[PDB]
Amino acid sequence: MKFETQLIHGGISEDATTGATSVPIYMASTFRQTKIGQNQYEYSRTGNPTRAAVEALIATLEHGSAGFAFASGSAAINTVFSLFSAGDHIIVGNDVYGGTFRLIDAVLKHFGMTFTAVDTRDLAAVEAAITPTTKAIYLETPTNPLLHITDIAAIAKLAQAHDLLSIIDNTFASPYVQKPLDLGVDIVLHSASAYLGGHSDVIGGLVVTKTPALGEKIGYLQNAIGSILAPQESWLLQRGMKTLALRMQAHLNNAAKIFTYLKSHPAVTKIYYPGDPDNPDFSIAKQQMNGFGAMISFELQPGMNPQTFVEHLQVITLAESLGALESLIEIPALMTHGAIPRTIRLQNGIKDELIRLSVGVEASDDLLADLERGFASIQA
Amino acid sequence: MKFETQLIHGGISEDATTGATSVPIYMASTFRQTKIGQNQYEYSRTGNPTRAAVEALIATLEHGSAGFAFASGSAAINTVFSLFSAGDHIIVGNDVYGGTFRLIDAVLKHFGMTFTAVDTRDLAAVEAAITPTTKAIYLETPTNPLLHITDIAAIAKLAQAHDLLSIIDNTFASPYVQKPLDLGVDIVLHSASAYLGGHSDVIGGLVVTKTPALGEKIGYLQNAIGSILAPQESWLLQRGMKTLALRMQAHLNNAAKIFTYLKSHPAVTKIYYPGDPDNPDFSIAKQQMNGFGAMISFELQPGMNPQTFVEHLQVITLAESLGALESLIEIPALMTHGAIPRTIRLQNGIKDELIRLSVGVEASDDLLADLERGFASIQA
Amino acid sequence: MKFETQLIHGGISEDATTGATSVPIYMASTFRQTKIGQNQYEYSRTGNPTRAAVEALIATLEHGSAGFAFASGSAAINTVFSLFSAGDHIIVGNDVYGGTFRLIDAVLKHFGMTFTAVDTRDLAAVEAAITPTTKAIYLETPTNPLLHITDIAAIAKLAQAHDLLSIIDNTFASPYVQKPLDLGVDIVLHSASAYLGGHSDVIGGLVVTKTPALGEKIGYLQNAIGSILAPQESWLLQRGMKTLALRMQAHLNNAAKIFTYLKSHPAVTKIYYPGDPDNPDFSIAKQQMNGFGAMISFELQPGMNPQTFVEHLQVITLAESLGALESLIEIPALMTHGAIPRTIRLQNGIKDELIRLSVGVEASDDLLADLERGFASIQA
Amino acid sequence: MKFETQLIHGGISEDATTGATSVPIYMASTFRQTKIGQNQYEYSRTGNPTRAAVEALIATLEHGSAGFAFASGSAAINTVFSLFSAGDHIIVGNDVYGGTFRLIDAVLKHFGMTFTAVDTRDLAAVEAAITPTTKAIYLETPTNPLLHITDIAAIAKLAQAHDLLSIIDNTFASPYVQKPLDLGVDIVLHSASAYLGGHSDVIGGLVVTKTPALGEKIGYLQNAIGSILAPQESWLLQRGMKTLALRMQAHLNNAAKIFTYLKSHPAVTKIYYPGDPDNPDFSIAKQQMNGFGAMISFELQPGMNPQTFVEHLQVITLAESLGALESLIEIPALMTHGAIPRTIRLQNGIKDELIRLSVGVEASDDLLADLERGFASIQA
């Protein structure tokens, strides 16, 4: 049907036998069998009706073939990279969530995997990074937290041309804004803690594969490694997913309003927003994004203290995470990207004074009034 | 106090501010902060009051220093082995759960990790397997499904003598029967889907470390990889853990009764039970095990069909998993150990006719009557 | 705060001690006490942090003083009417949900309570029904299922003039559309199974009182009778409430589109919609309702079979309940109002061919296309 | 089967279609229908697979025909008494839980219902209370908190002889100790917050009827009044019920040990325990009770302060409720029976210095050591 209708009714969204208008929460760890092998489900880790349904939904939403729900976005990333073996080289984006940076440096390189960081907006930089042992290209768009917009279909074509895998981290856009499998990508993955759960009460990850033979691989790993999303929280994700469209419009609209508002502040010295029209990413954003996202990062004038600004907001809420109905705000150097050494941070674009604002769903008037409370506290 | 009292009151078992006689279920993904860094909790993946409490409990029960709860026992094993890097060699037990076999062969060896299988009851075999790149010894006791009893304190001393790590998979015994950290081991890990949840409605894993510096390492990995146990199911584990003592006595007692009963059957050609007194493992079992477990594996006479036997039980329940209040039964070649190639299975002790019976909690009379229903369905 | 911001942040919407961006689920039945009496909470039935927060929220949303959450809307109605004693007379609306009819006839009249049904759009009819033993006026607007719009502030003034209580059942409008406490009413009550939970996975009721001395009375009854809303489902209500504004706009807009669409069908012989402009209720609706609701009832031409029409819809879903993201549809004579005798039904406006359509949130195009599938099946 | 096996496998304890070893949690509020009326379930309040299964279990356990799960024990009592109408007279026990006293005085007498309190151990007192408008006999055994043991089969025969209903509140014994439907009673009801949930994290009530025509009546009221037990907490009850036998033995045994221990204290001036052999209730207790319960009430010497005693226990926990794995303790005049006026309390047996101890499951040694801490603080 149309996309709004797929949220309500797509995936598996009911119970065949009873008519229940809500996938039951199958807490059972195991399932009895009449004949061996013939049983439809066998063990809750290998798969169960509750997580099966959330998996179904994220996949129809992403225009892919198979969904896979994981305990966290980190856990999803980890078993996706478990496709690769020692010797393999991966090209990564120069700006990714600090944890993806951490999992690579602190774990994956232990496993014989090598990495090269690349501004994947420069395709020649990407093309130049491809070695005979290179096996994949991993990137986010928009990036955490600078919101660099990368050309998905471009990177996908590069990947196919060289028998590489394309892995896009679609957390910030969500399928309402971007469906990377529709631009040639092989694997799409989400931190469903953000916009797909949307209510600030679920940690989880999602992977959606387009080919069926890579669904086999990601599934075999999901079950062999077991970092699965549990029944209650699979059920909550799917519950929060049903409002994704309604929530995401409210986010996008509010963020338009916050950007025009921050641009009109001289206290604000730089702004990161894919809808900034002097931003060179502006056109690739329009082309591949239905909306410009609801994340804005910005810098204050160098003498101005961002912690003062942030600790004096009162409707906006100082915390990590993003994609929540509540507008969260954060200083990535002191929080989500402290896992990256300060020298690499400043080298890749993340000054110590950067502020990252997950625009939320509250009434726009109350948000601007609140941001004013924070500008007022640093004398502006 | 005493162990039964630690189940009810140990770990964190209440709520400091309210008095609540039950750790609240902290579904929040993130936590607001008044001043950056100084917040007690930050992000539900990194840790939250609900999972923190289950973590506390499994650790006081295991006589260790730190607990870590994971999405599944598999997920716990995976991030424990993420301590190791390419080049490292691990000695493993010749009989481990087929999934541990699978994670090793299908994933871990991709990461440059090498393995040697060893009957860790033969300490000279173990001693002989130790190479200059060997870094750890991983084993279960009792083993899945043959219930080989290994000398924990012996393997621990071997490990310390060679600057190795000892990793014991304590799923079948549980802390009520065995506390391997008390015999010199560094890491203890559980499939909490079995006896610790005990109710057949939770998938989860637990790791407990004894040193504090290895708790730091396992924690850093728990958070960086993210295969964490979610709040609802952390809460259910801890709920099921409170009855572990009551349930485990009932299991052990029933299993004593099932063994004497199966031994008196000529249809039963071989039996695997750590309390079998002609079993050479019998004495190391008495020495290090408070009870003999509630798992029995057995073989029928070669012309007798184990699937007929199993598909004709009606109180006992044909399914995977174990440690449940309900007595589960299973054929490991056709089920939990199908992940091991048939030739390696027969080579390591697992005939195609082996039956594995998780003795449960139902009334012993009803169980023997039921097992009779299955013997009746095969004689000739 | 503006209303959209109160959904996200109003009531109690976080956890004071931790910062948790989600009221924890306090499953504890009881709370320890250091000193007797001086404990803040005491017993989960009497009140707990989880249900306390949902109670807080429905009350700030309704512009009242106290919230009270119940196990179901029926259970809320029952303990509200438990204010009254034998001898008391209540005026009720001629069109109320069949269960309110049932609770009155089958239970409340057993208790010595007397009732008079009255079209509360005719204020003289209401005024004329007031006897010396009359103690309250109970009504819904819009009514289930004919959507008769009653003048709330008019009925409120009548009530105060005669030392009566005004009880309005605000289920169909919800606080986004109507806030009856702002028009002079004493008690507002909800079937939170409808729009406040909004996700078709919560049964519950809410009562909000404006005076503080009637909050005392409703509270004393909530605890003495105990028909309370449990912690998990209190938590889900409040979770579903956060999107009420986003969801309710989508509902209202879709319903505008469905009405214009049904009006342009000659197969449709009569329509019940508070926004029908030839409907005499149209102006009192504009005056007291922010939107016209998202319920439409309609009749087909007398030879046309409504069960054929309904059993041939495929995006719309044949079931009881309403207020769900999914568009539910139903035949009140054969379903929600079978509890009213057929003769009283036809007498009060409910023909056997009436159809009631809870307009939902799915894309409007897919809904009209679907309703066409049902018109096509009866030949029009 | 045997009773221990019915806890694990009785009622509905699995899922027919999947084999799930755990009744799924059917959060759906409503159920789709293919043809009207034909649907097995239709609205979660009227009944759903999750609560249906808990209802099934409490009924097979109680040797009755129909189970009914309610939001709280209070809510169960309230809709059971909703069978009666104005004019009806009920005989009640002189010692019932203070809330049952409150619901009667503060609500039920409003409805034209009249009550007579009677020591139902004296059958002539009961016989003498029966008026032409008397319709039922309501009592608890053991009573809250004095644990008066009443002759169930005697009261049942009295009831049938006079076309009365017998309603026994079986909360303190639980079906493991007493099954009143087996002694001639019509209605059995439980506060499942106590021993049936057993884990101190569920509020709920249960009613079990023996005749099928009274199951119809209690059901019609359950649905019309709606004070139902919600899906998550229905699921938790049934989860806690599976260990009832294991937990209840531990309770009973510990309580034997606590009584002998308290009897040997001269600081303890009076003791209430159905197993006290100088207690005249001792023999009717042996005859109708499998065990003597795990509640002990006792008085200290008149100069000794019970709040000092209680506020100085540290394994035992000062709170309301009972039946929990943790040993709770309480002063009924200052807590659970403050709802009864002090003069009626002292008149019926409840001095201001009475202590009520819900013996729990913790190790007996740790409990006696703890009670010593409280005797030490007042000096024995």
Ligand SMILES: Cc1ncc(COP(=O)(O)O)c(/C=N/[C@@H](CCSC[C@H](N)C(=O)O)C(=O)O)c1O
């Ligand atoms: C694009 C992307 N992909 C993947 C992920 C990971 O997904 P999750 O495992 O959290 O669900 C994220 C996470 N994002 C959160 C993480 C908070 S920091 C974690 C903790 N403080 C720590 O120090 O480790 C954020 O930027 O605010 C992500 O933005």
Ligand SMILES: Cc1ncc(COP(=O)(O)O)c(/C=N/[C@@H](CCSC[C@H](N)C(=O)O)C(=O)O)c1O
């Ligand atoms: C000693 C030990 N350590 C660890 C684990 C893993 O713990 P979990 O991740 O399951 O919680 C187990 C598991 N045991 C279950 C697994 C069922 S098979 C899985 C599935 N059919 C598949 O084909 O993969 C069993 O033997 O019955 C284990 O016995």
Ligand SMILES: Cc1ncc(COP(=O)(O)O)c(/C=N/[C@@H](CCSC[C@H](N)C(=O)O)C(=O)O)c1O
């Ligand atoms: C304005 C109003 N107030 C109160 C309520 C009651 O609230 P709840 O207890 O359901 O949450 C409702 C209910 N409405 C549902 C009830 C379904 S019928 C019940 C069952 N089939 C039965 O035969 O009894 C409906 O019309 O579709 C209500 O519309």
Ligand SMILES: Cc1ncc(COP(=O)(O)O)c(/C=N/[C@@H](CCSC[C@H](N)C(=O)O)C(=O)O)c1O
């Ligand atoms: C034999 C019996 N039947 C029924 C019930 C009622 O069952 P529930 O509704 O609690 O589940 C009970 C309750 N018993 C608890 C109630 C705590 S007091 C309530 C509150 N403090 C208030 O002041 O009101 C107790 O004695 O400790 C009961 O002992």
